[model samples]
Target: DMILTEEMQKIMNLIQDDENNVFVTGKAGSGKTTFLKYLIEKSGKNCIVAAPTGIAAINAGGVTLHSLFGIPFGPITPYDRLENKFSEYKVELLLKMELLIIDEISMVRPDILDTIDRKLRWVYESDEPFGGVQVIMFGDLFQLPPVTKKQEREILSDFYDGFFFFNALVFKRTGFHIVELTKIFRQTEPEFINVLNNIRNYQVTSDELDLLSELKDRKISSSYDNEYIHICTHKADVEKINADKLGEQEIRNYDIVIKDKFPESSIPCDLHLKLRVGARVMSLVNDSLKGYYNGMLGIVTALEDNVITVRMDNGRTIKFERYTWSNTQYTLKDNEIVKEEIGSCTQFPLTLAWAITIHKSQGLTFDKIIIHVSHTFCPGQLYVALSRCRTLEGIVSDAFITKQMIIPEYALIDFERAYKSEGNYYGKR
Candidate 1:
């Protein structure tokens, strides 16, 4: 078993008491998921884990919150009634669950959170927050904000105080304990971590900007093109770059095989993956016994028969066969939460690492990256892109660094102030 950091152990002790409502936040690659997986297995409490998206749900080994609670898309108002939606078994599961773990809380809207609170209350017959379940949330709010489309935004303007989950009405009334993990295992360089943290806090100084500007217009060498990933803001840019990069190389196509009903969006990699001898690929799943993990990068050295050989950047050679991703649903069996594999997809557990969108790069660590800051739309896009790499020396930029690109959301800043004002001990940094 992997050992937990001191701060992680402290948080674990707090959670083991089974009384605290916790919100765990940290910088990218701060081992949020690592701690979460450990807690889920050892907490010994009847727990239900859920995430906002299907991909996230699969990664968390749980179902989506919408599927778990039958939450409808669009704005969920306080006045909205969720009637006869949950089955008797689901209601029983909700009542028996002593803990609720919500991964990727940053993308969960306030209204959606309130809706979950309302549903829990309805099921548990209690007016308390989350039906009095010990709710634990994990996500970096600086990585991705909740998606509020124009129509939903117009409707939610009157109802929601802000876009983040912290703005939820239930949280406003029943404050949770905040624990921000300070130890960063991804990037080791002190200077680089400081720059990333400054960008995260919206306090990037001129010196740091100058340090970042040194990477402006830097290009990956042709000899090492497969060693670096291009992370941009938009899907079009990601698609175009990947397509162009793959087009330049002699490629082979691999088709996907589905065993059951699986949504295309839920599949981690492309349905039709194109590869080449020198193509850069990333692992889509963690295989600890095999010594490979998600976001691990490698070059395709050989593709023979149905097996694809990868030379990992870590100086390990691995041959990958078709791997299966199971889509599961959680149900209660004799008061114990159990996973039921409802669907599955079998494919190479690899995706082209030539380029990826900033949104998709969450929870992924890269040794080298080229940031395309031209199409960044939201507040933390630039920060998220820059933080994907392990070191400043591994970073390159298509554009120059500027203060105008470092805009942080006021809601998040205000939430931080409110968090500090409560006298809660912040991160152990």
Candidate 2:
């Protein structure tokens, strides 16, 4: 059920080419990660995979771009305050790599990408694009943009025209090849998916508005059966709600047994997962050759010998097991691409989803949700928050979502220009 679609498989030839710097764009649940995994598996040796954030990196079985390239994360006039640059080993890795894959491209700032371009050129001493290395990026600009502070935006805008990766100077020089996946596997309902797409493209009509307005006054009852996860924009409120819910019932202590794999370079999956007799939870990783995926929601039904069994809303009860999540590093071994398991985390791929923040809830699918969109203060924050639920009936929110709160025109235009390839090049805006 979790195999790559035919559309995703067709990109293999393009991914194999050494000269193609491809950009893969997709809506939520469009199998972006699956495509990346397939690329890594087929791309023997001479390939390096990295992501914009730790969670994204971990999910992609790679390290952060900052860690891989040894570039500073913050806003900077890079050349001036450069104290410690890429080490000899990092430089060597960059030198021999023929391909670099960046995941979660939406969160990468324009200047940071330029810094990467600068570092690769500096290290290899090659004036070519990314040291003549083929780069394939995966992210959805409509999902989440880079989180930039007010001062940070001003600094980045001073150096570059905009904060999005699409606005980088390198794109203007040697434009990236864009591929967008329109089919959604996570949601099978056609009408529901269309509504989501309209919302994603910032083209919601009156009928769509009428459809979503049904959620405007929806509310959850105290005695509502099964479960509903409260979604918010702040982490503190999420944790507080989770604590109160877990405390309301007689919570039990279940310790996850780490088997052969030990997580390194990044924190274990939801390191602080706590569950009770009826706690709402979500699976964090997909079980190979199984039905439960990375985003399936469930309720804790029974616990014994540190073993937890969950009853999903779909009426399937499965005993949770300690699954292996590995952090793989790829390198050329005897002219062959060898997948080296540098670190692993053997734990139940489950997290208490009594509540979760919008930033942390990326790529997750839920059955029922309670959204607190009042705190959504970014361009794509509200869309990310509201789309977590699979259907409109699954949403439970009292506050009305206005068109102004749906999709900011700036992001819509930036997203448009990205595919259209119309933006200021280099320095002058």
TM-score to native of every candidate shown: 0.94, 0.87
Question: Clashing residue pairs in candidate 2, if any?
Answer: 45-337, 261-344, 262-344, 263-344
lDDT of each: 0.82, 0.72
Candidate No. with top TM-score: 1
Q: Per-residue lDDT of 1-429 in model 2, one digit per residue for the tens?
A: 557656566566566656767778788778777777877777756778888776677788787787676667578654446555766655666778878888888889887777787888888798886777878888888887777899888776656767788778777566555667767876778887887777777777756766666676544623234477777889898888778777856666545444453444465475546677888788887774656888788888987655779987788888987676666655556554456776666667788777889887887888788777674366677777767877778887757566766756575566566455533121222
Which residue pairs clash in candidate 1? none
lDDT tens string, model 1, 1-429?
566888787778778666688888888778888988887887564888899998988888878888888999788778876774788888877888888899999899889888988888888888777888888889888987776788887777787777788778887557677878888888999998888888898977877888888887644522237578888788897787777767756788888887776777677767888999988888988898888988899988999768999999999999998898899887878878777888898889999888888888988888888887763457888888888888888888877878888777877887788777776533221
The clash count of every prediction, one per candidate, is 0, 4
Alpha-carbon shift of residue 391 in model 1 (angstroms):
1.3
